[PDB]
């Protein structure tokens, strides 16, 4: 729900997010949506080859929590994963966030 928060795409479901990413997205494009299975939290949905990825972001007492990392704002979370991988395979393929889907 946040107004005045350009990081927030919308309250699209997982399947609706997959459709938008496949229809208009390029590798590295992503969107941030409410989580369907944990409604007070968020999901980062990433356009990736083969199968798109979805990552959990918990909002706990103002702090944005992803994996073992903590960020004061969603914007800083996004900036971190533009330069550090958000996903690494066991064979070394790394994925980064590039830009928000419009």
């Amino acid at each position: 729900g946040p107004l005045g928060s350009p990081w927030y795409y919308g309250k699209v479901t997982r399947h609706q997010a997959e459709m938008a990413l496949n229809e208009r997205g390029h590798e590295g494009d992503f969107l941030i949506r409410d989580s369907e299975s944990s409604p007070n939290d968020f999901s980062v949905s990433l356009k990736a080859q083969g199968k798109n990825k979805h990552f959990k972001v918990q909002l706990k007492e103002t702090v944005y929590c992803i994996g073992q990392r903590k960020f004061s704002t969603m914007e800083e979370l996004v900036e971190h994963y533009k330069k550090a991988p958000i996903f690494t395979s066991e064979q070394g393929e790394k994925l980064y966030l590039v830009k928000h889907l419009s």
Partner: peptide, 9 residues
């Protein structure tokens, strides 16, 4: 709904 693992840190 299974979520993908975030890269280790």
């Amino acid at each position: 709904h299974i979520y993908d693992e975030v890269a280790a840190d």
